[PDB]
Each structure stands twice: as structure tokens, then as C-alpha cells.
Symmetry: D2
Subunit: 388 residues, 4 copies
């Protein structure tokens, strides 16, 4: 009867989300800066379980070692005061002008070494605060023109960078894993590892692949027109969904970062159905921006709506899967047969089975309808609460 | 002075390309059927090196074992008469109604076993004709609605199918490799393994990954808005570019299959630059459709233009790379530094190098321009033959 | 409690929708042909109010004047037997090979005159059957390459064609209006008048603009990434929404023609909200294709779902607009002020009003939040039936 | 032999283009601010004919009437010193936070009146500096959510605003025309009047339509996947191409504003062919951003490349149109017949012409190939300078 989140639902938010001041490529900030302590207190009141940060969200760029310890202490006290956790952290390798051609794959070698040292410094801080996952979004790794970047050499440099970070955490004995966040474009014309598939493929060429997974974001795969629940299914199949970023996006255009549930609502439904069915147990993290039309009351309304929409879709997807009429429709569409092996009898038995070829009635099999439209209308009725 | 192809340039064409009759989702065929023998003779006259086929392009669906041997004999004689080769073949698992929900990942198990037997039958034929690469385009593997396909079970079935094909070729002792061709959508609403990245990631979960690579197509990655030369660089980096399909596409829309060089011309330039620099030695295969506005004279003009445009872009990309002014611009943009290791001194030396962090002048590094616009204008002048 | 359509809800379907046999650019038909009489009877049973047709759906291309009258008589009897109406008709100027470069803007002049005579013949038939609206979808008017079509001359030819059709209906005294249906691409690489805006602009250059409006289709504007409710608002503002085609589309890709409510569900909600608020009184027509995975039971399930989803969204949008909490939120976001004139006092009073510039406090106005996220979450809760 | 621009080629640049400091939604400025006087001097040296400005590029927001006259005087002296002209100006109604929900269609009425007074103030300045065209880009007119903006009321407000500006210029006796610049999205989720077609249609509902035309931008129509030369042909057909913005864009994604010739090169070729054939006589204006990777040497290289690429494509398009082989191909594809009226004999003669229907041989007409692929390959060879 109530869709109230509790810290048990594992909802987490980046400091940079509710703290986004509203600067966009065509306009100035519409909101004042939020102190991270205040964000932690407000998020805790709304039912969130934790927060995440980039190094530069928490410690302003340039800070002295003492200003640093000052910023971390106040933050740690807010966490102690509220019971909030820090499950993930990441590095900002995109805002400062030095990173204009990238951090790990910048053409200048000195910038690449600086990017690695800035990252390692924040991994130590993240472990101290108890984060389990370290995200890497290579927002400036890419190009606007074809001759500017030899991509084979850049992938060599990207591999070199992640291999060194894995050597570092293993040498330190840290129990933290890495999660690469793909994005196809923006702010570079084309970004390297642009989709979940490219990131999963890259990981298999790292020296210690078991330390790396993906942190897919709803809106980013949708900027390439792709089906986000399908890509998450492939990540889960691979054993590599270490974290996830939830938000909304209306199609192929600039990265909108709308609140979760906005954008493609049916994709949100099928995503929640998959995460809850698959038993995904990581944080439900929102990487969203409250629109710059909003004042601070609207920021908190937008953040609350992220959690509300997850909990309504969870309820609808659970009602869908529990409906006996839906279970019968699933059998009518042969989802049960999809889960059976094609040829557990083995290759030789397949080759010798005349019912598989010589005496297969293809015209009868072809005439069988798949009954998918009835099934999808049951899913629609459940999403809209119209059953029925 | 002449851009004349020769069989030494390794240009190949599918039978289904020049033989496309012009049927589209809104209209009837505009051209009569071409006998494959006639296509081989005409392509050989134009300078092509070989042809490829789906089983059903060569042997009409349903054929008796004797009609079959008849079709193959006439084909083989045309190949002997012209010196044409058959470097690749593939299976049609998409046209017949029985495949309406897929071949390898159809929900019905009997259809999946039939799809495997139809494939194995054509692998034997392909080896007999000397093909080295067997392509698989899973055009019907996918869905229009979210409940119709559990994607983890479908990937299990896809893996099962490719693992069985690998067992078959290894048991037979055949020296043929497989190449998976991705496509993001069309004819299904979403197709499984939608991009080169998803296909490369999937391959690493097969039992014998070394037998499988990718067959990327220009237009398919562009249907997801992605940079095709970048994806080919990732395929080459992985050692998995076993074959390639060349054509043109104007952006994100239905699969156009225009002749190579049409569509995104600068991407075609950077693709040729990469393939020729990387020493790609496989066939240059065109998967294109002469527009249905054309008669048979226009079909052959369109096919010739595919080869012509490759050879002009090859010449322009070679002139670009050989230009001393371009080599100096490449150094000015630090492409030479991109190819150097970031930290061949190792992790501990990086950690101890104060020039990498404590005493790194970030403001000086940030002020350095990358000079990429001058470089790209040199590439433009070379493409347009305007140097200059 | 029930979402049962009745003929009073004005739902209409094209013969070609439920009768689509399932042929797509990569596969053969999966369903047998439906006799139009049978479609009329089945649709009437499901609660539809009427059907629409292209000339060639009803009378096979080539028919003799006697076979023609035979086909029309049986059709008319089915309409009499069921109470079904025919509110719209249209011409097929896209399937036959003669139309491969267009009907009204074909480069060959003889084909353009033939296209006009084929159209005029069907306008007479449409009036006889009582249609009020004649739709024109110029699916083959366009090009795959830049030199093939001079677009200024083609627009002259398009204007010439519609001007002649208007002269014909006015001379005959027919009370029928024309509705142009835009589409951005497919089957041509680019189609002329690709969006609702281009079609409305073109109409204003016709000799008798009052006889012409638009027939926008959900999926077509979404193939250009555009907001369909916004474009319909512009069509309504102009007084030109003469008819509408309802269906679903998942983003920028081939024309899917899914059932209404599939695709972008929130856009469907805002569309129904607008049509019902604006008092649109024309037919609610579905231009959709039941997926080729389906047998005939699935065709009728898909058609019923079109009507069901309209009626559920109508109920949710009406509950949204009637909710006092939503009416207060609308005032909080100043929708009431949007409807007031900016300067009904006139230009001189605006120029003399120092509160509009010299003494306007821009910092105070800037700080006012628009409260749009709270409003949108109320709209989401109403759509999901989660209030709340 | 040289592609040197001269002020006679009418190339113009906005102050905000070469002066863009490099701030993007994910990063800080990489370049220092340019004094507009310095931009005018540098552009004049490169061969430009003039500059354009938004009010806030020239006079910083908030300026006192005296600081204002100071900024304008220095600017005017730079123009006198260099011979540079100011053919266009525009208003910034998008950067300041007060415009976060729009200027002319903001929900708050006080902001709409302020937007009008800010605009009128700059129209006076523009006339003083001799501009002939006043551009309006409604970058903040739009919405991220469906309930935030009733689009019919917003179009009423947009019409009200432009009608008042037309009353103002006519009352003042100014000889200046307005040009509306469409864009489909960014920075709002959807922007009103998103394409050239929507803008042309809107203009026909203004009180004095002859004072308004369009200022289309290459990259903006390409953000909707549309064919930019086609839309410009429709604008020219309507008599409404008052100005144009040239730049490059790689497909459907964020607004890149690359230099002209980058992005879709063949579209750039067909655009130049059309503008030069049609005798477009307005400024060739570049709205581009030098990438933030560049230092000031790269800014000027990028600006020069805009002009260079126009002049090379002009030469190639002129060589194409002058080639006798191309003129014969144009006749072979019946472009000459496209330009002839379909039915100058009139409606009754068409109806009575049995060669148009009863005795039209449709099978013979259908078999005629259009020869478009040969023509397009001639256009490709001319673009690449490969003739041939
Ligand atoms: O940096 C990690 C991330 O998820 O946080 C915001 C940034 O844009 C990226 O999407
Ligand atoms: O089947 C292999 C392939 O490359 O050939 C044509 C088909 O559409 C696919 O693109
Ligand atoms: O011809 C009118 C129309 O609405 O019916 C189907 C066709 O594709 C078009 O969309
Ligand atoms: O404001 C007019 C314009 O052309 O200049 C830049 C702005 O983004 C817009 O594109």
C-alpha cells in the first residue's frame, strides 16, 4: 500500500547527482553548491542506503594534504551520524583541462602517468571508507577525428593502465573490484569501449580478468539505440555485473540522466524484472541529474521518485511472474523449451536423428504461432495495474 | 592513373548481392532472378576474385539430393571456367517461415536441432568448395517484446550451438574458422549480439575460442551510431578480424546496404587506412544491394563502383601516410607518444616518481594544444586530392 | 472495471494491418492471405467501428472492370451485415515496380500521369463507400542518392499533383478532404516531406490549402527521434489534424508498426491525454502489423490490444487531469500563466513598462523552481495506477 | 590552384565560435577568453567577410549603459579598421538562469516580457551596426517532461512574441528580417519547432509572414537523422532561406558543431552544389566550435578549414555540373523530365488521355532502369577528384 524505501532496498546515489548545479553546454548553474554533508543527511532521510563519490566531489581539486583530511573527517562523521554506507567510489579523469585528450589513453605520456597516480590515491581512500567497487568511466578516452587516436595503441595503453591498477590492489591486499562504465559518445565524439559488449570483450584481455566487471548505465546503452535489459542479461551471463547505474533517457540524443522510470518506461520494467529474477545483490545506484528547472525542493522530489519508481516496478514485475495466467502463457510461448538443451544427447546423436532433418516436418513447425502478443499484453496489463 | 581491380585485390561478392531482385517491405521485385553461373561470369569480368553464398542462394530450399548435385556441378564448372574462388560461405537461417523466432535460439527445441543440421550440411559443402571462413548472421535471434525471450537462456542455447559446430569441424578435421556477424536490429526488434563488442565478448565463453572471430559489416555498426573503424581496431587488437563486409549506410535507420563508399565517406577512408596499415589479408567482401531503381546495367555499375571506391581510398590513405607533412603533424599531436608504454619502469617506480604527481605541472600540460584540427584538415585535403 | 471497446469509440483498422502476411526484407510470409470480408467480420466482433483500405488491398492490381465490381459488392455486403463504416481510403503508389522512383514525383512523366489517374479512380470509389478522408503516403517519393532527384522540381511536381486532385474533387462536388502522411525514410533512403512540420509547411503552398491536412503516424515521427505529442499539438494548433495513425515504435530504426501502447508507453499516455483534451473527433486508426511470429489467434489478440491500451490510457489521463492534487501542481508550475497573453497591453505599453526590464529582478525570477519533477511524478503515479 | 578565401566569398563567423572557451557538460574551459576586437582582427586576416554576435557576446550581461557604449565603440573601431561587416545578430535567451524554462514561451509571464525587452534592445543595436538579418534560436523553448508545457499554449505565446517583434520593426521602419533557427533537442529534452519543416509551417501563421524565414544549421537537422540538402531545397522552394549556419555533425548524438566539411562529407558536397546552383546570395556563416583539445593556433586552423572546405567543394560541384558526361547521365536518369509539368494540358485532358491509364504499358515503364548508380558514381569521382 506504500512504496516507502528503506536502507534494506540498497538504494545509493552519487554526490554529483543531487549536487549537480545545473550547468549545461548552453547555460550557467541554476542551483548553489551543496555541502556533501548536507546531501548525506538529506538522502538518509529519504530512505537511501548509501552514497558514492568521485575524488573531486569530496576533495576539491588542488587540496593540500591537510584540507584533504579535513574534508574526509567531516564526511566520515556524517556517515557515522546517519548510518550511511559508501559502497562505490570513482575518479574524476574528465573535468580538469589536463584530461582534455583523456587520462589513461591521452596521447601525452606524462598525463597518462598522472592519471594513474590520481586514481591510485583515491583507491586507497575508497578502501578506507569501505567501498567494495571502484568504477572507471573513461569519459575523455576517444576522439573527434580519425587521425588523432590510433585505437590499437590506445587499447594497449588502456590495458596497461588497468593491469597496473590490478597489480596495485593485489599487492596492497585490498578487496575491491573494478567496474568499467561504457558510454558511446559525449563528451568525446566517439568514446573507447562504447557499449557493454566492448567493455566485456576488453576485460577478457586483461592480466587478471576476475578483478574487473562492468557498471552499465541505462541511458548510455540507449544512446546507441540498444536494448538495456538484453545487455544486462549478457553481463549477468558472463558473471560480470558488479554494479549498475539507474536513470532514464529518451532515445538517441545527448546524455539526459533523467530520474529512473522516466525515459523508456517499459525497458525499466523489464530491467527490474531481470535484476530481481536474477537475484542481483549489488547496490541500486542512481546516476541522474535533477533538471536545471528545479529548485532544491525539486531535487529531493526527483531523488525520491527514483526510488519510488523502482519499488512500483518491482511490485508489478513480481505480480507478473506470480500470475498463473502468465505462467501458462510462458509455456504456450515455449519459454520452458528455450531453457532445455538443444542437444544434450550429443553431436553424434544429433547427426543420426532423422527427426531433426530428413523427416522434420518444417511446414508444421512453421505454422505454430509463438503467442508472443498475448504474453506481451499480459505484461502490459500488469505494468499498468489493469488486471483484468 | 587507372583504378582497375584485379583478382589480386581480393574483392569478393555474395551471390545475393548482385542477385537481389529488389523486394523490400513495401514493394515487389523489380529485377528478374539471376542464374548464379551468370553472376560468376559477370563478376569475373569486372575484376572480382571470388564469390560467397548462403546454402539457399545456390541450392533452392527443398531440393532433392540429385537436384542439389546438379546445382553444385554447374556452379563448380563456372568457377573452373573463370578462375573464381569461394573463400566464405554461410547458412540461410532467416528466410524460411520455420525460422521466424530464430534458428539457434528459437524457443522450439525441434527448430533449433533442425537449424544445426541445416548448418552442418552446408559446412561440408563449403569445405568441398574450398571456403576458409564460415559466417553466421543470426538475423532472427532476438525479440520484439521483453517476455518472449529469456536472454540468459538464449545465450546458453547460442553457445551450445556454436560449441557443437566447433566439435563437428574439429572431429572432421576441417580447416575452416567461424565468423559471427553482428547486427543490432532488423528483422527482429532487437537482435542478440548486436555489435562487434557483444560478439567478441561472447566468443570468449565458447569452448574453443580460437576457432571463432567476427565478420563486422560497415552498415550494421552504423545502425547503432557507432564508429566502424574503431570497432574494427578493437577486433584487430583482439586477433579476431577473420572477415569483413563492406558497404555504405546513411546513419541510424533501416539496413541500406549501399555500395561501398556511399554513406559515410570519411569513415570509409579511415577504415581503408586501418585495414591497409594493419596488413589485413582476408577478402574484401561486399555485402551490398544495388538499389531497386536499377536495371541490370545499373547492378553491374554499382558492383564496379564498390571496387573502384576501395581502390581510390586506398591510394588517398597511402598518400596521407607517406606525406612528410603528415608525419610531422602526427608527431606534433603526439601519436608517437601514444605508442610508448605508460609505465614500462613498473608500478613501484611509478609510485615513487614525484614527476608523475607531486611535482607534475598540470597547468602547463593542460595548456599544450593537441593540434588535431590541423592534422584532420591534412587528412581531408588528402582524401579530396586537394594538396596543397 | 472493463476496458471493452464499442463502435462508439471510433476505432478503425486498415485491411492491410491484420491482413499483413508477414513478408519482411529478409523472409517469406508466415500467414495465409485474409479475405477482406473475413477481416471486416472479425474486426466487427472485436468492437471496431470501421475499416480503411488502399485500392490494391480491396481490388487486386490488374483487375477487369467486372472483377472489380465483384470485389466491391462482396465488400459492401460485409459492411451492411456488420454495421462497419469506411471513414478513410488511400491509394497504393508504392508496391508495383512501376512506382520504384515514386508516383507523383517519379522522374518519368508518364508514370506521374498514371499515378494521378490511379488515384482519381480510387477517390471515386472512396466517396461511394462514404469515406470522408483520403490519405496520401508518398512512400516512394524520395531518393537514395543526391543527384537522382532535384528536390525543388520534385516539390513542384508534388504540388502540381495535389492541386490537380483538389481541382478534381471540387469539380465533382465531393466532400472529402486530403491528409498527407509523412515518414522520414524507408523504403527510400530519404522521403520527401519527412515530418509533420514539412507536410504542414508544404500544404500552405497548395492552391486550396483548406482541403488538405496531415495524417501523422506515431512510429514515423519517432523514426526521426521527435516528440510525437508535440508534433500533434502543432498540427492541432494549425487546424490540420484530419486523421491519425496509432501504433508503437522503439526508437530510431526500421518502421516497426507495433501495436498501439507498445514502443514508447509514456508518449502514448501524453498523446491520449492531448487527443482527449483537445476534443479530437476523428477516427482512432491503427496502422500496425501483428508480428510475423504470430498465427491468426495472435493477430486478433494484437488488434484487440491496440484498443485496450487506448482505453486504459484514456482512463489514466482522465484521472490525472481530474486529480485536485494535479490541478494544484499545474498551478505551482505556472501552466495557468503560460495560457495568459504575454502582452495583451500591447507593444507600447510593454516598451514603457519598467517592471519588464529596467526594474525586473532577474535573480529573484531565476531562483523560482518550476516544480516540474513533482508534477511528472504525479503523472507517472497516475499512469501506473499507483496513487498514492 | 589555390583555395584562398576573399571577403567576396561572404564567409562569416560568430564571435562565440572562435571564442568558445571549451566548457562542455563534463569539463572546464581549456582556453582563455578572446577579446572580440582580437577575433575580428584575426578573422579578417584569414579572409572572412564579417562577424555575427549575440548581445551577451559583445556586451557582458548586466552592463551599465556606459560600459555598453564603451564595448560597442571598441567593436565599431575594429570593424572600421578591418573592413569587416556585421550581417546578422541575435539575442542570448538561453545562458542566464532566468531563461531556464524558456524566454518567449517560459511559463512565467514576467520572464516572457523580459525576454521581449532584451530582444528589442538588441534589434536596435543590430540595425545600428548594419545587420540585415536577426536570428532567433529558441534553445530553451521546450520541455523534459510532458505535463510541464502545453504546446498549443506555448505556440500561442511564440506567435505572440514574433508578432510583437514584427510590429516593432515595422513601426520603427527598420529593414531587417527575422530568421528562426530550428534544433530538435539539447539543451531541452525536446525543443519547440524542432526542424526546418516545423519552423516554416509556424511562420505561415504569423501576422506578417513575409518578414520571417529560417536559418537552418547543418548539424541540427542531422540530429534528427534528416537530409539537410533536402530541407534546404524545401526552404528555397518556399522563398524562406534567409541565412544559413554551416558546420559538421556525425549523426544522431549531442550537437557537435564541428568545422564545415567534417561530419557527413557527401552531404556537404550536395549542399554546396544546391546553394551555388540556386544562386543563394546570403552569408556563408559558420556556427562551429573548435574542439577543446585545441590551443589558439588550432582555433585559427579550424576556422580556416571551414572556408577551405567550402571552396574545394564548390570547385568539385561546379566541375560535376559542367561535365558533359554528367549532363548526359542526368538526361539518362530523366532529371530533365522531372522538371517538366506532369499535366500542363489540364485535368480534363488528363482524364481523357487513354495513354495515361487504359493503354499505359505499366510493365514496360517498370522495366526501365533509372541509371542512378552510374550518376552517383560520377558524382563520387568528381568529389574525390578521380576523373577518370
Ligand atoms: O564517472 C562515473 C559516472 O557514472 O558518474 C557520472 C559520470 O558522468 C559517469 O556517468
Ligand atoms: O547472412 C550473412 C550476411 O552478411 O549476408 C546477408 C545477410 O543479410 C547478412 O548481412
Ligand atoms: O499508405 C498509408 C499508410 O498509413 O498505410 C500503410 C503505409 O505503409 C502507410 O503507413
Ligand atoms: O543562437 C544562434 C546560434 O546559431 O548560435 C549558437 C547557438 O547555439 C545557436 O546555434
Amino acid at each position: 500500500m506504500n512504496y516507502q524505501p528503506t536502507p534494506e532496498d540498497r538504494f545509493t546515489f552519487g554526490l554529483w547527482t543531487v549536487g549537480w548545479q545545473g550547468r549545461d553546454p548552453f547555460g550557467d548553474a541554476t542551483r548553489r553548491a551543496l555541502d556533501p554533508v548536507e546531501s548525506v543527511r538529506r538522502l538518509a532521510e529519504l530512505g537511501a542506503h548509501g552514497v558514492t563519490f568521485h575524488d573531486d566531489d569530496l576533495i576539491p581539486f588542488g587540496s593540500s594534504d591537510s584540507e584533504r583530511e579535513e574534508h574526509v573527517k567531516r564526511f566520515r562523521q556524517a556517515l557515522d551520524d546517519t548510518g550511511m554506507k559508501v559502497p562505490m567510489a570513482t575518479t574524476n579523469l574528465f573535468t580538469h583541462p589536463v584530461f582534455k585528450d583523456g587520462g589513461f589513453t591521452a596521447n601525452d605520456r606524462d598525463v597518462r602517468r598522472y592519471a594513474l597516480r590520481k586514481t591510485i590515491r583515491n583507491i586507497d581512500l575508497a578502501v578506507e571508507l569501505g567501498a567494495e567497487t571502484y568504477v572507471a568511466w573513461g569519459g575523455r578516452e576517444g576522439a573527434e577525428s580519425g587521425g588523432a587516436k590510433d585505437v590499437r595503441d590506445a587499447l594497449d595503453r588502456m590495458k596497461e593502465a588497468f593491469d597496473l591498477l590490478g597489480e596495485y590492489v593485489t599487492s596492497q591486499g585490498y578487496d575491491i573490484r573494478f567496474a568499467i562504465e561504457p558510454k558511446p559518445n559525449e563528451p568525446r565524439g566517439d568514446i573507447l569501449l562504447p557499449t557493454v559488449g566492448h567493455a566485456l570483450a576488453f576485460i577478457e584481455r586483461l592480466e587478471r580478468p576476475e578483478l574487473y566487471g562492468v557498471n552499465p548505465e541505462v541511458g548510455h546503452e540507449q544512446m546507441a539505440g540498444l536494448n538495456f535489459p538484453h545487455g544486462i542479461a549478457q553481463a549477468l551471463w558472463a558473471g560480470k555485473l558488479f554494479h549498475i547505474d539507474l536513470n532514464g533517457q529518451n532515445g538517441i540524443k545527448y546524455d539526459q540522466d533523467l530520474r529512473f522510470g522516466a525515459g523508456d518506461l517499459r525497458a525499466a520494467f523489464w530491467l527490474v524484472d531481470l535484476l530481481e529474477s536474477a537475484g542481483y545483490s549489488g547496490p541500486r545506484h542512481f546516476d541522474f541529474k535533477p533538471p536545471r528547472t528545479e529548485d532544491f525542493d525539486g531535487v529531493w522530489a526527483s531523488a525520491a521518485g527514483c526510488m519510488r519508481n523502482y519499488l512500483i516496478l518491482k511490485e508489478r514485475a513480481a505480480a507478473f511472474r506470480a500470475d498463473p495466467e502468465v505462467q501458462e502463457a510462458l509455456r504456450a510461448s515455449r519459454l520452458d523449451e528455450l531453457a532445455r538443451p538443444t542437444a544434450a544427447d550429443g553431436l553424434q546423436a544429433l547427426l543420426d536423428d532423422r527427426s531433426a532433418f530428413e523427416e522434420f516436418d518444417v511446414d508444421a513447425a512453421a505454422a505454430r504461432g509463438m503467442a508472443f502478443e498475448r504474453l506481451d499484453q499480459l505484461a502490459m496489463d500488469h505494468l499498468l495495474g489493469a488486471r483484468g
